[PDB]
């Protein structure tokens, strides 16, 4: 009936490959051409907490999938599902017969399990993740049957089938109950005898360490953790390795038209390095058969990227990113600056100083001139498209700036030339910034030049990526330099625009934190975001498609009005590369993390000539 790849006739325990496959495998329509097996695709990630390269190169394996335009979903691990008429009720099949990586059954108990005792259970998320949450309230997940499992949600729920295709609404299918079970203490009345073995003290850390987190370094540190991925990881993760190797899942659970069980290319090996300029280098000599994530907003290095090609053996192809802005300011509004969080809290201070910045130089010197000045607004062609969202405040105005900064009171100087506080010390904020992202400490070093002009000092503090999100989560920032999602991903990505994402609204960490717990934690935010995260609580619930558009057009205007973040520059186009001997890239997909770029274009089928 089916076949399987060469290399799995050097396994002699493996049953047939009619019997590893479910009955009725989902078939995988190829992007360009029926494949062939074999090969390793050579790829790369970051020494500092890039697990996140593995989950976008072999894609996120949840109960529905992208399509290639980004337009829909469709059913993917679960074979069918439906949905009640009022949206909230959403029953799966399952796919009979398939398999875990280790041969055994992946059944509805499984989904059970990871909902029910992982997700949902309080002492492993005191806030459950709110991709399975209706106003912060979760949904009841029950067996039907051995192969059918059904979420009742206790509102309407029109965007689940979304959430479920992205990378953190994977957890339904990342935990095998038969594995993790032995480190619950609903299931192992000995789990206590577990905790010495893993170096924890509490059963969530042993949760943790042993059967992971989507984000967690954990998920590709280990070789026994059952998955149901297009490849297993063999050399982990973790350690002070140069280099992470998976192999094929031999229970795979996908054929192509031919019958052919996928994956088509039989191993990946991520170099894992240490430094940015060797990525650079490596991928300018051909090294990468793939790299699309860490090259794709370093315009300054695409002249010999683009130069290289021929030598290299490689296609350079762009994508549009979903951003809207590649480099935007994330204020504190609870910074512990006592002085700063005076005038941190008045938009008029925000306003002076994105009217103190020049865009024209940054995307000049920062992005050669490929970016756009803009602000975090959803991009014209967007139904969400707000002008002043986008546009206001853009236009360099330094003397409307200094003359705002004196209407504050902020017009007292020190031996240096800056304004101070009435009451003394230099008005001055500190920038958290990722140390290998170029562009970024670029462009904050153009903008301490730009807002010495206005008698402000930005004082950059570099990390790498794990004590960035620990300041971060600490609260210990004033601005903080990253990505504003939303130019096309605004409802999937709203992070910018109200503070529900807890490590990434860097308004305010903490008023997130008090969001996320229903006020129980964190610092009460200000009316207007109070109003603007009841009424995302009342988007998520809508009952219409009408009621939807017109409170997240709410959402949209009061943070427009706020002015809470400050955009540089919208995306360049992304540069992305692929060897030319690798096959069935989809060069046209959008680039962006809710669609796991570039893991949408089902690595799987992706195979060399
Ligand atoms: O080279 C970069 O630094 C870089 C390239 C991307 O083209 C650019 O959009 C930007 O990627 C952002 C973000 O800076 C990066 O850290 C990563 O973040 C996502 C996600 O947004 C985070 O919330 C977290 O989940 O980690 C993710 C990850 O992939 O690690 O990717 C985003 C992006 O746009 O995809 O930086």
């Given at each position: 009936?089916?076949?399987?790849?060469?290399?799995?006739?050097?396994?002699?325990?493996?049953?047939?490959?009619?019997?590893?496959?479910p009955?009725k495998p989902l078939v995988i329509?190829?992007?360009?051409?029926?494949?062939?097996?074999?090969?390793?695709?050579?790829?790369?990630?970051?020494?500092?907490?890039?697990?996140?390269?593995?989950?976008?190169?072999?894609?996120?394996?949840?109960?529905?999938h992208?399509?290639?335009?980004?337009?829909?979903?469709?059913p993917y691990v679960?074979e069918?599902?439906?949905?009640?008429?009022?949206?909230?009720?959403?029953?799966?099949?399952?796919r009979?017969?398939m398999?875990?990586?280790?041969?055994?059954?992946?059944?509805?108990?499984?989904?059970?399990?990871?909902?029910?005792?992982?997700?949902?259970?309080?002492?492993?998320?005191?806030?459950?993740?709110?991709?399975?949450?209706?106003?912060?309230?979760?949904?009841?997940?029950?067996?039907?049957?051995?192969?059918?499992?059904?979420?009742?949600?206790?509102?309407?729920?029109?965007?689940?089938?979304?959430?479920?295709?992205?990378?953190?609404?994977?957890?339904?299918?990342?935990?095998?109950?038969?594995?993790?079970?032995?480190?619950?203490?609903?299931?192992?009345?000995?789990?206590?005898?577990?905790?010495?073995?893993?170096?924890?003290?509490?059963?969530?850390?042993?949760?943790?360490?042993?059967?992971?987190?989507?984000?967690?370094?954990?998920?590709?540190?280990?070789?026994?953790?059952?998955?149901?991925?297009?490849?297993?990881?063999?050399?982990?993760?973790?350690?002070?390795?140069?280099?992470?190797?998976?192999?094929?899942?031999?229970?795979?659970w996908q054929v192509?038209?031919?019958?052919?069980?996928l994956?088509?290319?039989?191993?990946?090996?991520?170099?894992?390095?240490?430094?940015?300029?060797?990525?650079?280098?490596?991928?300018?000599?051909?090294?990468?058969?793939?790299?699309?994530?860490?090259?794709?907003?370093?315009?300054?290095?695409?002249?010999?990227?683009?130069?290289?090609?021929?030598?290299?053996?490689?296609?350079?192809?762009?994508?549009?990113?979903?951003?809207?802005?590649?480099?935007?300011?994330?204020?504190?509004?609870?910074?512990?600056?006592?002085?700063?969080?005076?005038?941190?809290?008045?938009?008029?201070?925000?306003?002076?100083?994105?009217?103190?910045?020049?865009?024209?130089?940054?995307?000049?010197?920062?992005?050669?001139?490929?970016?756009?000045?803009?602000?975090?607004?959803?991009?014209?062609?967007?139904?969400?498209?707000?002008?002043?969202?986008?546009?206001?405040?853009?236009?360099?105005?330094?003397?409307?700036?200094?003359?705002?900064?004196?209407?504050?009171?902020?017009?007292?100087?020190?031996?240096?030339?800056?304004?101070?506080?009435?009451?003394?010390?230099?008005?001055?904020?500190?920038?958290?910034?990722?140390?290998?992202?170029?562009?970024?400490?670029?462009?904050?070093?153009?903008?301490?030049?730009?807002?010495?002009?206005?008698?402000?000092?930005?004082?950059?503090?570099?990390?790498?990526?794990?004590?960035?999100?620990?300041?971060?989560?600490?609260?210990?920032?004033?601005?903080?330099?990253?990505?504003?999602?939303?130019?096309?991903?605004?409802?999937?990505?709203?992070?910018?625009?109200?503070?529900?994402?807890?490590?990434?609204?860097?308004?305010?960490?903490?008023?997130?934190?008090?969001?996320?717990?229903?006020?129980?934690?964190?610092?009460?935010?200000?009316?207007?975001?109070?109003?603007?995260?009841?009424?995302?609580?009342?988007?998520?619930?809508?009952?219409?498609?009408?009621?939807?558009?017109?409170?997240?057009?709410?959402?949209?205007?009061?943070?427009?009005?706020?002015?809470?973040?400050?955009?540089?520059?919208?995306?360049?186009?992304?540069?992305?590369?692929?060897?030319?001997?690798?096959?069935?890239?989809?060069?046209?997909?959008?680039?962006?993390?809710?669609?796991?770029?570039?893991?949408?274009?089902?690595?799987?089928?992706?195979?060399?000539?």
């Amino acid at each position: 009936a089916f076949t399987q790849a060469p290399m799995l006739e050097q396994n002699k325990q493996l049953p047939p490959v009619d019997q590893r496959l479910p009955e009725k495998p989902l078939v995988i329509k190829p992007i360009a051409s029926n494949g062939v097996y074999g090969g390793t695709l050579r790829t790369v990630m970051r020494g500092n907490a890039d697990g996140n390269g593995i989950l976008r190169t072999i894609g996120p394996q949840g109960l529905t999938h992208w399509t290639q335009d980004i337009q829909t979903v469709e059913p993917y691990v679960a074979e069918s599902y439906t949905v009640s008429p009022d949206a909230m009720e959403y029953t799966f099949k399952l796919r009979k017969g398939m398999k875990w990586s280790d041969g055994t059954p992946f059944t509805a108990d499984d989904i059970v399990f990871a909902m029910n005792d992982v997700v949902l259970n309080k002492e492993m998320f005191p806030q459950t993740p709110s991709a399975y949450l209706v106003g912060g309230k979760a949904p009841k997940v029950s067996k039907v049957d051995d192969y059918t499992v059904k979420f009742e949600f206790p509102a309407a729920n029109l965007s689940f089938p979304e959430t479920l295709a992205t990378p953190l609404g994977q957890h339904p299918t990342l935990y095998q109950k038969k594995y993790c079970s032995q480190f619950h203490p609903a299931y192992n009345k000995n789990v206590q005898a577990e905790f010495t073995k893993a170096n924890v003290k509490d059963w969530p850390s042993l949760m943790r360490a042993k059967c992971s987190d989507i984000e967690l370094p954990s998920r590709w540190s280990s070789t026994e953790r059952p998955s149901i991925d297009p490849w297993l990881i063999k050399e982990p993760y973790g350690g002070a390795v140069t280099r992470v190797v998976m192999e094929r899942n031999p229970f795979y659970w996908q054929v192509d038209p031919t019958g052919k069980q996928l994956p088509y290319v039989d191993r990946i090996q991520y170099a894992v390095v240490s430094d940015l300029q060797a990525i650079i280098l490596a991928a300018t000599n051909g090294q990468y058969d793939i790299e699309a994530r860490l090259l794709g907003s370093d315009v300054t290095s695409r002249p010999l990227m683009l130069k290289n090609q021929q030598k290299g053996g490689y296609k350079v192809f762009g994508q549009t990113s979903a951003n809207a802005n590649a480099a935007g300011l994330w204020l504190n509004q609870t910074t512990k600056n006592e002085k700063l969080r005076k005038y941190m809290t008045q938009h008029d201070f925000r306003q002076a100083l994105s009217l103190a910045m020049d865009r024209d130089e940054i995307n000049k010197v920062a992005w050669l001139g490929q970016a756009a000045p803009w602000q975090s607004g959803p991009f014209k062609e967007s139904k969400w498209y707000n002008e002043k969202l986008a546009t206001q405040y853009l236009k360099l105005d330094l003397a409307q700036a200094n003359q705002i900064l004196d209407r504050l009171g902020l017009t007292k100087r020190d031996s240096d030339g800056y304004r101070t506080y009435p009451d003394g010390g230099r008005v001055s904020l500190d920038a958290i910034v990722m140390i290998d992202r170029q562009a970024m400490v670029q462009t904050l070093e153009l903008i301490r030049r730009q807002w010495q002009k206005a008698g402000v000092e930005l004082v950059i503090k570099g990390s790498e990526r794990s004590l960035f999100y620990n300041r971060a989560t600490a609260n210990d920032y004033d601005i903080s330099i990253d990505v504003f999602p939303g130019g096309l991903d605004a409802t999937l990505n709203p992070r910018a625009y109200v503070a529900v994402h807890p490590l990434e609204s860097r308004m305010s960490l903490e008023w997130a934190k008090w969001y996320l717990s229903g006020g129980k934690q964190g610092i009460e935010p200000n009316e207007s975001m109070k109003k603007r995260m009841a009424l995302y609580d009342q988007f998520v619930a809508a009952k219409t498609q009408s009621q939807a558009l017109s409170l997240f057009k709410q959402i949209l205007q009061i943070s427009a009005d706020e002015f809470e973040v400050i955009g540089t520059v919208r995306p360049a186009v992304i540069s992305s590369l692929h060897s030319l001997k690798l096959q069935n890239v989809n060069e046209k997909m959008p680039f962006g993390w809710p669609y796991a770029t570039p893991s949408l274009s089902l690595p799987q089928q992706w195979y060399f000539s």
